[PDB]
Structures are given as structure tokens and as C-alpha cells.
């Protein structure tokens, strides 16, 4: 019964693809000791993930020039130490157009106009549209307060990150690896000043949505700025692309 889960412009949102997504995320959580969240809203989260995948796929797949595959074989061989191989290529082609389009929007001045440690931190996104259609910000603030409080109280992290986030890293708990104070968006200098490893960090106001940050751990300048820039402009671009779209639930 692989029916269509949603109507998304031209293509469709199917059931086998969400099945594959659930299988992959749950097996990875089993391997990586990440708590397996209850499939009450996990179904809808995976469905939303696939829907945004399809919309970002329609914007760009029809354009550009696909990608080669031998480099994919080499990369997966390195990462090792025909159903599976299909999803391996799609995440590269979807990121290729994503990596390209965000660069086109943002322009870069020479770094010398900007004059001149690594930390592990997680991120959670509350999807707020261009304007609160149902005044979501009103409830958004209440949910943000509740969830940051629960994070303080000592709840597990995979469940909270999975619960109702929106970004692509959210599946794996939303950890962004090691970052320094100057690869993070220009709104978290005060947040990193007023933070510590493992304590509470208040939610932050933003156009895209509030963000929950948990301190999980503790030539260059071009990438120093590029990381955080890329962050904010890619987030804004994906939000705007999602908003200007036609998606209908089917069930």
C-alpha cells in the first residue's frame, strides 16, 4: 500500500520513502545509542522532512547538471570503516544545488574589511513563518520556555531534539560538531558569554524561529565568517522556499 502521502506541486510524497527514512534513522539511533523516540510525532516529522526534500528537489533538480558517482563510491568506501545506493546519491545532488544556491544569494566582501575554541553544541528550530499566521510566536514562546526548562531538568537529548524541530541535522540530535565563537551566527555572542557546559541556555529570538542551544562540549578568517554566514542565509532561504509552496496532506 505505497500510496501518495501528500500533494507537492508536480511530484508526490510516497510511503516507501518515509518507511526508508524511519528505518534509517531508527537503525542509526540503535547503533549510536541515541534514544529511540516514540513514533507519535516521528511519523509526521519524517513526512515533513520528505516534503521539504521534494520541494527543494523540484527547485534545482529540474535545473543544474546532476552529479558524478565514482566520487560517491570513493567517499562511501572511505566512510565504510542497489536500494541503499539510491539514497546515497540523492543527498549529494540535493546538497549540491543547496550548497550552490545559497552561495549565489549571499555576496562576500574581502575579509580585510572585517579585521581579523572548538565547541560541540546542538540546535533546535521552531518553524515560524514570515508572519505568525496563527500567532504561533505566542505559543512558540511558551513551548520554547517549557522545553528549555525540561532540558535543564535532565531529560534525554535525542528525544527533545527529535520532538518538533525543523532543520536537517535534527534527526541525529542536531549536533553541529566542533564550532568556535566566530563560526556561529552573529546573534550568539551574548549566548556563548552567558553559557556553560551542560547548563541551560535561553531560547533566542529570530525571524526563522527560536533556537535551543545546549553546550555539549567545552585565510582562516574567510571560513571563520563563511560558516556562520552560510548558516543564516541558508536557513532564511530554505524557510522562504518552503513558505512559497503548495503542499496538501493526503490521508
Q: Which residues bind another protein (CB under 8 A)?
A: 1-4, 7, 9-12, 14, 16, 83, 106-107, 109, 113, 130-131, 185-187, 205-207, 229, 232, 236, 246, 250
The least distance separating another protein from the CB of residue 210, rounded to whole angstroms, comes to 11
Residue (of 145, 221, 157) closest to 183 by Cα position: 221
Q: State the nearest-atom distance from the C-beta of 5 to another protein, in Å.
A: 10
Q: Is the CB of 102 or the CB of 163 nearer to another protein?
A: 102
- Of 80 and 246, nearer to another protein (C-beta) is 246
C-alpha cell at 84: 541503499
Q: How far is the CB of 236 from another protein (least distance, A)?
A: 7
d(CA 211, CA 6): 28
Q: Which is nearer to another protein, 36 or 245 (CB)?
A: 245
Beta bridge partners of 213: 123
5 close to 251: Cβ distance less than 8 angstroms: yes
Q: How far is the CB of 212 from another protein (least distance, A)?
A: 18
Preceding-residue numbers of gaps in the chain (C–N over 2.5 Å): 81, 116, 218
* Smaller CB separation from another protein, 90 or 229: 229
Sort strands 247-249 and 211-215 into parallel, antiparallel or unpaired. unpaired
Least separation, in Å, of the C-beta of 227 and another protein? 13
Nearer to another protein, 158 or 185 (CB): 185
Do 51 and 88 meet the contact criterion of CB atoms below 8 Å apart?
no
Amino acid at each position: 500500500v505505497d500510496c501518495v502521502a501528500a500533494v507537492v506541486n508536480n511530484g508526490v510524497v510516497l510511503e516507501s520513502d518515509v518507511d526508508g527514512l524511519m528505518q534509517s534513522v531508527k537503525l542509526n539511533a540503535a547503533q549510536a545509542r541515541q534514544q529511540l523516540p516514540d513514533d507519535a510525532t516521528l511519523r509526521h516529522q519524517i513526512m515533513e522532512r520528505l516534503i521539504m526534500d521534494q520541494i527543494i528537489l523540484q527547485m534545482g533538480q529540474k535545473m543544474g547538471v546532476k552529479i558524478s558517482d565514482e566520487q560517491l563510491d570513493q567517499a562511501i568506501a572511505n566512510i565504510a570503516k542497489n536500494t541503499y545506493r539510491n539514497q546515497i546519491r540523492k543527498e549529494m545532488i540535493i546538497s549540491e544545488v543547496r550548497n550552490n544556491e545559497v552561495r549565489r544569494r549571499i555576496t562576500i566582501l574581502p575579509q580585510e574589511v572585517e579585521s581579523l575554541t572548538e565547541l560541540n553544541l546542538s540546535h533546535i528550530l521552531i518553524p515560524l513563518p514570515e508572519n505568525p499566521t496563527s500567532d504561533q510566536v505566542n505559543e512558540a514562546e511558551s513551548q520554547a520556555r517549557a522545553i528549555v526548562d525540561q532540558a535543564r531538568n535532565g531529560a534525554d537529548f535525542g528525544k527533545l531534539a527529535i520532538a518538533h524541530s525543523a532543520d536537517q541535522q535534527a534527526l541525529n540530535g542536531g549536533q553541529m560538531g566542533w564550532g568556535r565563537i566566530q563560526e556561529l551566527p552573529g546573534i550568539f555572542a551574548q549566548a556563548l558569554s552567558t553559557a556553560k557546559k551542560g547548563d541551560i541556555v535561553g531560547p533566542i529570538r529570530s525571524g526563522v524561529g527560536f533556537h535551543i542551544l545546549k553546550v555539549n562540549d567545552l585565510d582562516r578568517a574567510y571560513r571563520m565568517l563563511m560558516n556562520r554566514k552560510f548558516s543564516e542565509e541558508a536557513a532564511s532561504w530554505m524557510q522562504e522556499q518552503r513558505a512559497s509552496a503548495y503542499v496538501k496532506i493526503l490521508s
